[PDB]
Amino acid sequence: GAQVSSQKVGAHENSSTINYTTINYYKDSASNAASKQDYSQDPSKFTEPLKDVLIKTAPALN
């Protein structure tokens, strides 16, 4: 049941893709550490909540 993923390597030693391994030991998912591989989204629901979203090169008001 081991889980294997690539690390995003910052400073590289003078030695390519490096991995790490994770194994959940407990039944309850609450017991689990954080995966920290978190996806992102559009600010649009906050930055542009408009019914008619307009293109930036055209007049905001028309």
Binding site: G1, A2, Q3, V4, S5
Partner: peptide, 4 residues
């Protein structure tokens, strides 16, 4: 195992 599960390799991602």
């Amino acid at each position: 195992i599960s390799e991602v």
